[PDB]
Amino acid sequence: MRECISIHVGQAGVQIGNACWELYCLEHGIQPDGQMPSDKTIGGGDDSFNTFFSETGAGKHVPRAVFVDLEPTVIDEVRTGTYRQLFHPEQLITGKEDAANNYARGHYTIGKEIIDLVLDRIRKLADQCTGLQGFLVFHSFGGGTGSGFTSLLMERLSVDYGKKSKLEFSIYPAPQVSTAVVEPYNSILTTHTTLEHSDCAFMVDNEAIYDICRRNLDIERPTYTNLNRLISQIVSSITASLRFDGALNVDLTEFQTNLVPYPRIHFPLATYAPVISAEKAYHEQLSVAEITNACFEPANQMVKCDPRHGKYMACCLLYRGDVVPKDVNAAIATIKTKRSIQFVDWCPTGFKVGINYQPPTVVPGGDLAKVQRAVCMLSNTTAIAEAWARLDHKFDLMYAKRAFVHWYVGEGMEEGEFSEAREDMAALEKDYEEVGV
Amino acid sequence: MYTFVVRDENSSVYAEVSRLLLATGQWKRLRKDNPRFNLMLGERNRLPFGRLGHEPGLVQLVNYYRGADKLCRKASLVKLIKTSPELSESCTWFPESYVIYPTDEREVFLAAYNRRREGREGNVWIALISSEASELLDFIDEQGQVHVIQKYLEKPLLLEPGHRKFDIRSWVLVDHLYNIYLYREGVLRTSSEPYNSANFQDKTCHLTNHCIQKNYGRYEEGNEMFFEEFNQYLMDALNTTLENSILLQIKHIIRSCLMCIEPAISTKHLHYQSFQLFGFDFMVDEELKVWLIEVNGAPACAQKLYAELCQGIVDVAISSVFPLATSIFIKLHH
Amino acid sequence: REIVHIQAGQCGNQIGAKFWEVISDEHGIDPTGSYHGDSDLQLERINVYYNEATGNKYVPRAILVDLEPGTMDSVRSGPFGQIFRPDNFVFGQSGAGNNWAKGHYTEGAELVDSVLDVVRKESESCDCLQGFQLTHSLGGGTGSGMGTLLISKIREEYPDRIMNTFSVMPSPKVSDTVVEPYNATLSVHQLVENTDETYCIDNEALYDICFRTLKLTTPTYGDLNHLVSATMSGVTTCLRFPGQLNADLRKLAVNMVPFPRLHFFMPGFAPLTSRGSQQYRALTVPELTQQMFDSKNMMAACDPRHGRYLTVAAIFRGRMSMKEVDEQMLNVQNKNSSYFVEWIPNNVKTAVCDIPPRGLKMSATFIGNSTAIQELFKRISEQFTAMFRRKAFLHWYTGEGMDEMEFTEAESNMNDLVSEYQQYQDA
Amino acid sequence: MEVIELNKCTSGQSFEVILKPPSDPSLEEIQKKLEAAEERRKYQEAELLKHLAE
Ligand SMILES: Nc1nc2c(ncn2[C@@H]2O[C@H](COP(=O)(O)OP(=O)(O)OP(=O)(O)O)[C@@H](O)[C@H]2O)c(=O)[nH]1
Ligand SMILES: Nc1ncnc2c1ncn2[C@@H]1O[C@H](COP(=O)(O)OP(=O)(O)CP(=O)(O)O)[C@@H](O)[C@H]1O
């Protein structure tokens, strides 16, 4: 058994972490006080769930997680939340002033005053690990902390933990739920500085999650609670193979192997179905063929784009619920003849399938309905570059006029880092185009 | 009050459309880089489809189908027909063609070229036109880019008086629902010179382009015979109509081509929508068999039909999506 | 997230007094300082403007400054006069006589240190000071002259703290003296350098609103202040009440101010209502949106169509369909996208608060960063030149030590501000 | 078509299906980067306090 440490940075990262750990506890049968009756190995063990939870002699199961925000109000809701007993005080780190949606302020100014502390609190966990695989880092692109302090942290972890892997769960900025206007700056900046330090990153466009909540959950205007609960389901699907018995994606290393052939292009597209409303009185349960077919509908993707006009490098199908290999191959064979799925010439056209018989667990009183079977597809398609194009265009528009730039320069940053980062993004867009056409 | 943008000034067609839209007094034209548009009349090259449908509170539409270039490029069309079972390598309305790169499928072309000559049957091909392979097999290399070789129709239908060659241009509109609308008014882009079997090096007699011709304007005005005349000619000269002898094959080829690529370009469930005007170019042999020559993704209309066609584009492809406060199209059902 | 309020001069203290009168009623605080509300929402973010004292009593983090005791004695004998911490009353005796020089260089200098002692006293108690706010006029002497002197000295002792102002602009329609253009120009020079946000409150606009729109033949300063107190309450709603917006003054400034000098905002408010005259018909959302964007509802006498919005902020209050809000907000932009810069994506942001102000079931506050604000400065610059070209009334200033060169400089810096605004209007 | 690497257990099973075969900075450099930006702030703050001093 090898442990994984989850790092939640910024408002988005923290609040999503809460949604996830809440969900994990329900799936593993762990209670708000940290007691897990089914665990008969008291005070320790090396089961699959121990990857995410440590144990105390008192029988408490504690998340191998560290929450960090440059401003206390969000993490304070964790200190006094329903799962307050679950965490340990030194796992929750808060500052006084946030980064005001300013990358430079989160990275250079305020980041410097707290980086050594977080690393120490992270080291406190790693010392409780017999074999650390790496880290799962949750954060936003738009926030000054989630972007600024994250890239700083990622840089250091590659120094203090060179061998260890590092995955990302990144919230991509959407105007519909965003109040900021400078998020394109912060996004390009943190992507540039983090790229060489992240082995695999799962982007989530709030735009996509927002519309899924409107279209399929009949929620007129989703709050963060709506978005986060839906995001936790996707994350849970992706991490399930680390927390449960299986042979597919058993360690963080395998995520890179199976989804990331080229290091720089490490942004797999996630697609999830079915998303069904709990208020849907009468629902006809969907089959393996139907939900698998939905994995190629853009309206179900974490990022809106068109995989048809791109090339795949890898594709994983992660099922939860009543599913067997027979029905999957039947579905794949059928879908193949009807949809456009082009792979790169130097990759085999195939799917790695993972099935967990346990159906998806739902938060009581949540918006999601229980389903007999669900699936999350992880496809590394060049079509996700559209999201970089969108972001880079918004960057160019503002930067040409040097709008807001004075806020960053006033925190010690140089104007040249904007163009350095933008250049790196221009390279990334080109790499995607070499492979994609 | 809807809004649109224009990013292709050379567009003869949509320049007229942009004017019609303003004349209604219910549309506004923004600037090239204003993202808050309802409609986009985009550029021909590098159109940023990746930035459409990401404006909250704005239904977005564009006059181009992403991926439709696979049908509108000569090298792509051949690959599309040969590779796709829908059309198959045995496709009967497409000339036997082969993709040839400069120094691919060259050895296969020569294999078919031989027994063509070693079988007492006519053998002329086109990229220019020649009866010898090695003649222009070195031509294609001395140009630079990839070309396609295909069987030249040595037995074309010939218009009398004149004993003349011609090609048919049909304008097809595909809306956001992928309804395929054939414009009833097509045009025969004819040659004013008599067709000559003996020498292919001269091309004014073999090529029917609109600009090459400019005996011009002798028989018909501007070397453009419309359906009403061409129909009447067929009835008098061959005792048949245009619908029967030719148009059924045209409606078939059009529908077959677009149905083949529908799953690859359709915007049915997408976050942005597409429509597009196509220009199909057909060729008729002496046995009244229609052959597909090419598909144009950015076609230009004929002067008489600009007003009627462009009004049609607004009716079914734009106002269908953005409604305002006997049809000139034949719908090809499927 | 504590804010320190300062109010300087006759104008500054009278709008400032009414500001505390309004928000103290919203937060359920009574003239003594005791809470008496129906909700815990009123006390959740109340540390921002109030200090919790013994007996569970709430004391405004307010500092009342003037060079004469006339207005501040009126504040103290006013409605909520006793809520204020008596030590925070810092006043002189000589007055400033509508003289910027007196407020900035002589009479005010003699008093400014006394004020800063009170500022420091409050700032030290603050768990985490997020910034200062000043209420003052620019056409007088104290608020104009001394207020900017205070701002300069505050930025010296707090260079990394947000400084915002609610600045009343002078107009001939509503004029105390002829030297108001002089005091204003000198002050704008100071505001361009040492503030992150300045809410330009034009007395011309406030007058016209009261007259042309609000059915008032002869509006008083009291009538003008109803509009200012309403607006001030509106812009601080997100800071005062829990909601979707997790923002301190800095984060707010970051997303509104693309360029450091261009931070002069056009405030607006809907529905427009006169004192006493009750509102029976609640506005639909399409009406709130349509009104808050109409020039007639602007508090800076500028035509938005003569410029372009760099950034916009809108604060809807009350119980409403925020889906309808989004649609109506997204509507306006798409109807008039020409009056928004295309090189700042998504520059219009909105926030909603469930608690409406007193007397209205729902309301909207508009904060516009338009380039059309140049019309305001061009107006002052004209009135300035009209006198300065003849060196008129200048003796009042040279008598206090100022040189003509300092006027030429102030003039030049504001004409630069205008041309800088014009630069981004043509982009 | 070709199913391979089929692994089964109580919790579920996994496999792979193929339709068609094929055809860092050091702690030194960081701590200097962070300090070179702190010097730029101190310089900007200085030119402010000098400006205010004038
Ligand atoms: N999906 C989701 N997105 C969030 C959530 N919270 C914030 N965001 C997004 O995050 C972006 C802003 O970054 P934040 O995470 O809120 O800011 P931060 O990381 O705390 O950084 P600073 O406050 O600037 O110091 C916006 O685009 C929001 O849409 C959340 O709970 N769920
Ligand atoms: N296989 C073939 N047999 C006979 N004629 C042919 C032919 N291929 C092309 N032509 C002639 O060539 C002319 C133009 O060629 P083609 O249309 O392929 O190029 P083009 O795209 O530049 C004109 P357009 O795009 O408007 O159709 C046609 O009008 C047709 O007469």
Ligand SMILES: Nc1nc2c(ncn2[C@@H]2O[C@H](COP(=O)(O)OP(=O)(O)O)[C@@H](O)[C@H]2O)c(=O)[nH]1
């Ligand atoms: N809105 C408003 N404006 C005022 C008030 N008192 C003065 N003014 C304006 O402020 C200017 C005079 O400044 P004043 O505050 O009296 O000078 P000070 O007391 O020395 O700072 C003139 O332009 C007036 O129109 C007031 O109570 N309300």
Ligand SMILES: CCCCNc1cc2c(cn1)[nH]c1ccccc12
């Ligand atoms: C005394 C300080 C008044 C408050 N300032 C402020 C408020 C907002 C802002 C910039 N500044 N941007 C916003 C966007 C949405 C809602 C509110 C605001």
Ligand SMILES: [Ca+2]
């Ligand atoms: Ca155990």
Ligand SMILES: [Mg+2]
């Ligand atoms: Mg935050």
Ligand SMILES: [Mg+2]
């Ligand atoms: Mg006065």
